[PDB]
Amino acid sequence: SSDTPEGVRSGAGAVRDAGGAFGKKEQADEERYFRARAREQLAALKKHHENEISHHVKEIERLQKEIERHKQSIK
Amino acid sequence: FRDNGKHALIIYDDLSKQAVAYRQMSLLLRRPPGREAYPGDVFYLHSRLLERAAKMNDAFGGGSLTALPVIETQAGDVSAYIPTNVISITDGQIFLETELFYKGIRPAINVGLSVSRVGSAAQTRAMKQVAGTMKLELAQYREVAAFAQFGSDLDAATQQLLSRGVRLTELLKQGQYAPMAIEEQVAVIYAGVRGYLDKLEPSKITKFENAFLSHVISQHQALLGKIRADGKISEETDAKLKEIVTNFLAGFEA
Amino acid sequence: KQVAGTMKLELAQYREVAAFAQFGSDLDAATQQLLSRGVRLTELLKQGQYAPMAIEEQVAVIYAGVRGYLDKLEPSKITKFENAFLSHVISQHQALLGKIRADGKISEETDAKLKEIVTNFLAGFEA
Amino acid sequence: SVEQEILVTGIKVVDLLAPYAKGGKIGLFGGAGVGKTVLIMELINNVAKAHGGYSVFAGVGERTREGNDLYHEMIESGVINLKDATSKVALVYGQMNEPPGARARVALTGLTVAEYFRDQEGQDVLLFIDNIFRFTQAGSEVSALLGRIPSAVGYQPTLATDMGTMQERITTTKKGSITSVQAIYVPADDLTDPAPATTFAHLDATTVLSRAIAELGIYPAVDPLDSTSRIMDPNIVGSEHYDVARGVQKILQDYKSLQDIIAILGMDELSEEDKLTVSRARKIQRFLSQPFQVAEVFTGHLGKLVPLKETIKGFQQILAGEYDHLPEQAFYMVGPIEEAVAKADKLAEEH
Amino acid sequence: NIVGSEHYDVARGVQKILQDYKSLQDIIAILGMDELSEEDKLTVSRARKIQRFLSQPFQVAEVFTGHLGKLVPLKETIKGFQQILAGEYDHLPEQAFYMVGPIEEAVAKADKLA
Amino acid sequence: ATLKDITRRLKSIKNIQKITKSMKMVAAAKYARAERDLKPARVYGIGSLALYEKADIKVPEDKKKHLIIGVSSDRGLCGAIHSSVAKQIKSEVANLTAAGKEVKIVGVGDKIRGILHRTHSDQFLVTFKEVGRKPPTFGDASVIALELLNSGYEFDEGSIIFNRFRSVISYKTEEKPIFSLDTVASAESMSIYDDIDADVLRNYQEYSLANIIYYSLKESTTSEQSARMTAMDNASKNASEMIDKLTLTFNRTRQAVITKELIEIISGAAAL
Ligand SMILES: Nc1ncnc2c1ncn2[C@@H]1O[C@H](COP(=O)(O)OP(=O)(O)O)[C@@H](O)[C@H]1O
Ligand SMILES: [Mg+2]
């Protein structure tokens, strides 16, 4: 009874709207993934938080070389 | 009591039978029916009752009057006419279910849905320490512990947390007509959240509890009297309990 | 009537294969076509509030999508291309948006002239 | 008066997705226990202290307990002064221990004090009413005793007439203005009930609180795909505010089509583009939550008040990809986006 | 304290295994039996031996089906369910626990089919 | 029970009916390619079997060490593919470890290691991952056979267990033996066999290890796809029978609330 506007139809994202045993098979499945990516990315925050100083560091060295050029021009 | 100083408590068992005595009594007086032949003012029937449950100020006497209305519902449906009219008069609820009762959680309280406007959070000072962390460790459990079909293995990642729940779920079960005290509650809850039970088996924690509880009332009576008197679990009181659970765990099963 | 008889049919074939689009790359090249053409025609029909259009201008825009002059583009570049195709044809081709508003029917002498507008605009657009 | 404005309250769901208006009409929907006495007592803190004009709170049939907090929550906060004449609020209280003929006329004692401040004095007023469903519902308690045949589901046959007699006196004329905030109880979470569904036309702005969201800990509970304002318009709020809030709502409706796939295929079957959607959408969903100042007795956190220029900038970057390298627990219950990287460093130090 | 603490634990322990068969009927009907774990293919096969071991032939129903009405005593049901909960009969099929009296007829009906 | 609860449950299974009927059309194409690729590699495993017909070699009496290899995918929802291999594996290590030989298993793919990590958690040399998401190849069999040598474990007898694809409905789990020490590989049938040395038989048997894993990467991938088609048809037939029984309950429950609210009005007028 779906090929008619009078016959009722369903929405998008209604499986988790019921609250059955597929809505809790999916609410828990998402926590068993996005809890273990939360410590792949909590461990690599030691490195890249030092790398953003290393990039800044890189820039600093570059700018000091330019200064050096100007200082030699003056000389 | 309440208008003279003291503190009262009142249970209505139940309030779905004070409504069908109003539907019948006021149909034979020729009053026109509303929904489900209930009268117009069934909301006014329950509301003028449940607002006397006050808490007076201290320049009147300071007395209180709690109320615990019971409501029976049909087929566990909470969206009926007389349920929803009395959900929205009370500060908080305790949702008792059937699949909790039969799986084994007895008292069958849905601790997920049993919301409560906490009442200015007058839990008590020591229970705030151990059940503050318990509330979050159980909430962490319920998001992640509903598969019943496993394919992958993450014992360092997930299986440590869900082992803290079943030790705290099977701790929460109780008997009947034997209610505990609050410092006998702080002791048994201390041993669950502080990791001192993850080397048991969950089919032995209900056996672990009564052997623990009989040991502390008998041999450690001056310990529990410093939790009830001082209110809090102090840092030196944290020290003394650290041995007692481990001394008993050294010789529990032998 | 001339352009919507090819359009109402082809936006109806997209509705039957509209479930496959979520997780699909291992399908047939015909089914991967209906997911392509049907999502360009959906992007044409978007329209901002309080902007009614003249009739023969809509026969310009819909002639671009249903004939094949939008398949080689990106779907967030469809709702930009339509606005740039209209402002070029209002100003520099106003004499041909009154030859449909008078005659009514697209003759072949106009069906061969809009082929030399859309393809000679689809070159100098992507910049 | 025909003019529209904007109004900034400080909340990242109100100010981003359903913005208010100076003089508009604002209704707070949602069931029982979802957060309507908190969201209406937080806006009393935010707006009704930094305001030059006056305010009126009319209590139409609610708990007499909750009518003792707001009398004492605003004596210590300076809005009521019990010795001098510099108070800035007026209270009208007829509660749910009252016969149902007197719970139909405190809705009208409210907007008679809140009209002398608009018409007679040329001032600006704010109108706070909680709860306005008890005006309708206390008219169904004396319908058949008056002598009428009852209509559909049990309401009186004069529903949309006694309501619209009242909800047209709350307007902004050319002598003053009124900014009205009304809490609207939805009975049994049923929005298609005739008492709420005839109130969706007397209002400029709707903030609909759901319950399936506040069960996930997200607070304020406000539904992103069901709130709506009139001034969400690329000619009043600007064409940068508009492009953001029509991409937050577009990525949250993209989430629900994936949640039906996850329930069968599982999370580690999806492609690498659709995994990027769920991670940002869960980052956006957690970032819409914000610790209010009145949750300093419930949660123990500290309160935020985010300006509008930071709200647009923070959400613009999560959609771009400039925080794809963080855990989701940083974003839960922060203010600005610069506090959501000061948490991802403390989580990595205490690891 | 009334029905005896040994009986009370076979009572509440056989409702626990019966509820857990009901709480998976959404997934078994759609997906299949074959997408379950190994612990929850052992509250399914043990709670189908328990449902069948609650059907008894009555005395008044001999004239309908031609099967002898059986009366069991109390102490031979508690003893006969602890040997399905502990897991002693996990090799016998489920057609043997059906329409029998005391538990020794279940192993006898299992002895017949071979 | 009420009208809301019947609707939200019926709306859910109308979603699950679409998803599993699309998911059958996805896996009908994957099987249709994985039927094509297997018949080229059918003649590749013709050659290594033809070695053992003309020279009949067996495992003679006893070994000091052993291997067990079991292939699978990482993906679920295939019915009885993974438990038709793990339960075969536990049917042999019980049969072994009584003749005294030491056994150590390796499971390529995640789903074998998931089943056998609670009882057989100790006999694991290495584990693999990421099998069968992309189509399996021959360079994939040269990573299994190369890391199997960077292990130190001298192995003198082993076997591999895979599902031999029979038809669209039927698969058969079979076993095939592996002769890996040069002692058993140089026996009485190898007396006629010429110029290969002990150092050349070191070379030849090692290419057979990459070979015989490749023959079992082409069998267990077709059977894992064609049981992902048949078990999705039966989740789609079992959803059509659940909504047609829930439309009828919805229709009676719709009609019985029109009548219920109408008698509340008829009796509300006539009581005046
Ligand atoms: N910041 C918060 N956000 C969401 N809910 C909260 C917050 N702080 C407390 N709560 C809880 O949510 C409940 C909401 O109830 P309340 O808003 O007071 O009444 P109503 O039933 O009218 O919504 C309160 O009981 C409170 O315990
Ligand atoms: Mg409230």
From TrEMBL, chain E:
Keywords associated with the record: ATP synthesis, ATP-binding, CF(1), Hydrogen ion transport, Ion transport, Membrane, Metal-binding, Nucleotide-binding, Translocase, Transport
GO cellular component: mitochondrion; proton-transporting ATP synthase complex
TM ranges: none
Keyword Membrane: yes
Coiled coil feature spans: none
Biological process terms in GO annotation: proton motive force-driven mitochondrial ATP synthesis
Molecular function as annotated in GO: ATP binding; proton-transporting ATP synthase activity, rotational mechanism
Positions contributing to ADP 2 binding: F64
Subcellular location(s) of the protein: Membrane
Its biological purpose: Produces ATP from ADP in the presence of a proton gradient across the membrane.
Quaternary structure and partners: F-type ATPases have 2 components, CF(1) - the catalytic core - and CF(0) - the membrane proton channel. CF(1) and CF(0) have multiple subunits.
Similarity annotation: Belongs to the ATPase alpha/beta chains family.
Name of the protein: ATP synthase subunit beta
